[model samples]
Target: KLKLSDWFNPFKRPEVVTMTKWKAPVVWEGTYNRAVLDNYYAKQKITVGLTVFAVGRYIEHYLEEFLTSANKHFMVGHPVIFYIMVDDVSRMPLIELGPLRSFKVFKIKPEKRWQDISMMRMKTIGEHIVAHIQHEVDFLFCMDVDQVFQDKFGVETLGESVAQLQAWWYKADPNDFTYERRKESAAYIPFGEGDFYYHAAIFGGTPTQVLNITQECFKGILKDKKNDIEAQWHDESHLNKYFLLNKPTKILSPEYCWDYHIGLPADIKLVKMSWQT
Candidate 1:
């Protein structure tokens, strides 16, 4: 059983903002005590789920690197199920995983355009959750396959609803955020009214919460398709819109999702997961 007082706290580093106005944690590198969280969840025997998509060229280019790195760092010591969606089951990478980790590779049809692939991710993930993921794990994370795990991404990152602040736009103003501005599009978020620009690259929550998020985002994607308009950033724009209306229970700082090629900044003490450039 999960206990809020056993882990969540108000203590934080003075150098950075650690909590959102709604009281959700903004997890930075130095803000959390992982050992305590690990000890607490160890007894619960919770299984965390992660979903990644690799179709066509992406399979050959990124699958092996991602799985190898994730096995080394992602949810170390905790039970983890990786839902690998790919165009060809035969092409699945043969990398070995850790003791408490295993993966399921599912065959999926490839989209003609990359944009549709991105938008369709929410739909695909939603379907999987309804079909089997909901019963397989306690928490579910959906991530892009283009990233590599660089440091321990442990239990500190889990919550009822979790969102990752985009590495490039974490500090940018709301007006400058790449939210879909067109009114007709289902993902429309007015320029003046928005929060942080969330990265669609990584997002997760409890099975039920993730199911709702994916379903809602996919609904927006379908609505945009009906009107013959695509959001500026595809599913990312819809994700931003969803987050704006329903704040995440936990927000991961940019450190959790960094781009190493951008050069390390003073605040990014650790690159837990990095974009593979």
Candidate 2:
């Protein structure tokens, strides 16, 4: 059974103070904002969103393989949504997949230094997609395009607020791995040993909760100026720091997002093939 105290209850936090100086989005007049927000939250449903950065010469091979894998394994019998973020969808081959709740392809210009730290871009895209689904979806998952699911991914594994697999490199001592901070970066958060390390391959949670964490952590990364810091794993480092201090959710089992570096256990519920050649 899940503990009530461990779950994230956003109502307990102070309300966000909207500044009168800032322009607000147009909305229906006389509609109670709280009621609207509540109505939206009541219909919360779990949906998966995958962000892929396919540009230049690698578009054809990666995009087709990703969609084929998704159709065959991940979304086979699941009624989940798939959101693809790429440079251009027209340039790629057509995807003849079954009916999906929704399959959106967002075109984004490729960044110059994408290879150096492309993971950050993926994280940013995932957060952006979550913001759009804040009121529409209850749960949101951010996955890499390079990974292919080998088994069923049901909601039975998801805990309350946040759900992610343990890091393959340092699952035993996550705190030590998370504490190895970037001395020159401003995003460093002071912490002790034995913190949890989250695998970035697959993570999901309530849209609002995950979005809040992503924005907060991303801001910290952008604030840091040090280019050569060891903590420069980009978004992953920032996410680790934020969760280390203010844990958004409980640590999920390794079965949710198993990686190659970690030996496959008999209990692993899902298998993810790395996107690299």
Candidate 3:
């Protein structure tokens, strides 16, 4: 049982909730606004890790829409680093960013197929971040290149290890949830166990903490490769395994990753719209 002794006390015997019974506190749109969260991170520098691999020539698309929306709202007043990992460096578009916001493009060789490019994201992210960007920023969030942010995503979403509640599976029964099931793979999770399904397309946290879990997932992927087995959901499956053992300090609500096809729900403050076909 959770202890009542922990309530409203500072520097006291602040007891904690029962670990097994703890649920992630969701960050909701109604609860937070741009100005409040942005000012909180006023002095902090943030990094956004995004990839642009195998993106076909429908190129004149999302860069403008995504960048315009994000540059206007994403940590608007603070310093931000946008890491654009790409295969074709020459084709990467140049955007007009403000004083504290800029981007760097990295050249990673392209995989022959799109699925291969997607599956290898975890490994590539872990390796490069560890080698280069690990200590450069305070927090880092990994998001998809195909997504466009439609509203403010500020400091309220930051935490020790932040995880977004799976937009589709948050309320689904644990038994029916899609997690790695094979015992041969390191990401295997038993049917009865799981906290929540996290979107592989979006997640992040403090650099050291983020890299630790990501590298572990990459190793698990390598193990699966050696055993000639693959998790059903690719990188997301391994991410679930890591989060099951290590709970996030905060969870962002679906408001941050809302689907455009469904349109905006009354409570959804943002939409992660798909672009470029």
Ranked by TM-score, the better of candidates 1 and 2 is 1
Superior by lDDT: candidate 2 or candidate 3: 3
TM-scores of the models, in the order given: 0.96, 0.68, 0.81
Ranking by lDDT: 1, 3, 2
When sorted by TM-score, best at the front, the candidate numbers are 1, 3, 2
Per-residue lDDT for 1-277 in model 2, tens only?
Answer: 3232233232332221111112211111111133333333334534544445566565666767866666665533345566666677687666787654456666776655633344356456545755575645556666655665554444433333453535364335444564436456644645453345655555556666667666666566556533544354556666666665556454444544556566665444245334335
Worst 10 residues of 1 by lDDT: 4-13
Cα miss at 137, model 2 (Å)? Answer: 2.3
What lDDT does candidate 2 reach at residue 74?
A: 50
Per-residue lDDT of candidate 3, residues 83-141 (tens digit): 76766667667778876677777777676543355556766777767877676667777
Q: Write the per-residue lDDT of candidate 1 for residues 182-246, one digit (tens) a residue.
A: 99999999878887899999999998999999999988988899899978999999898999999
lDDT of 1 at 250: 95
Task: Report clash pairs, candidate 3.
Answer: none
Q: Is candidate 2 or candidate 3 better by TM-score?
A: 3
